[PDB]
Amino acid sequence: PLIVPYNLPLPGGVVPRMLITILGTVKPNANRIALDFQRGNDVAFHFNPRFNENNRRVIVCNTKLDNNWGREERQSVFPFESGKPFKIQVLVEPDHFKVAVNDAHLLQYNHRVKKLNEISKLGISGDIDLTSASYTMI
Ligand SMILES: COc1cccc(C(=O)N[C@@H]2[C@@H](O)[C@H](O[C@@H]3O[C@H](CO)[C@H](O)[C@H](O)[C@H]3O)[C@@H](CO)O[C@H]2NC(C)=O)c1
Numbered sequence: 357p358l359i360v361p362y363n364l365p366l367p368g369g370v371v372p373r374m375l376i377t378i379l380g381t382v383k384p385n386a387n388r389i390a391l392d393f394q395r396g397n398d399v400a401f402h403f404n405p406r407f408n409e410n411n412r413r414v415i416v417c418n419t420k421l422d423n424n425w426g427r428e429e430r431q432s433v434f435p436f437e438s439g440k441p442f443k444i445q446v447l448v449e450p451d452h453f454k455v456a457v458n459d460a461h462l463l464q465y466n467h468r469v470k471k472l473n474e475i476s477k478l479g480i481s482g483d484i485d486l487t488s489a490s491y492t493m494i
Pocket residue numbers: 402404416417418425426428430
């Protein structure tokens with residue numbers, strides 16, 4: 357068990373073929389989960405499942421530059437469930453982050469922050485018990 361919020365260093369930033377894997381369990385009365393890939397204070401890629409946004413479940417993705425959020429990208433496919441174990445895998449490709457949950461492809465997020473080598477930490481937060489967070493090169 358890792359304490360949330362958890363910061364996972366990404367030494368030398370991200371690069372294509374890097375695979376980040378997060379294993380956890382959603383708390384039974386969850387409101388949100390967030391993964392934040394950071395370039396100093398900027399958030400290159402925010403991945404944010406919301407369990408009760410006006411009584412709908414939605415995943416919101418965005419980028420924060422100079423303390424300002426950008427244009428949201430929303431996905432209504434929602435593979436998380438309160439109480440239940442999950443696996444999130446984020447594969448860095450040359451033009452996007454590719455996200456799979458529980459082994460099924462979920463979404464892609466085009467790189468808006470293009471200095472991939474400067475995206476040097478991942479913060480993991482929200483209503484989860486965190487079991488493991490790791491990376492490897494495929
Ligand atoms: C496209 O259809 C819909 C449906 C329901 C809500 C929204 C929406 O745009 N919500 C964002 C919210 O998603 C946004 O919340 C922020 O959204 C960020 C990601 O964009 C991040 O998760 C922040 O932590 C969170 O506070 C707040 C504050 O920036 O602004 C809100 N926007 C407005 C206009 O109030 C859109």
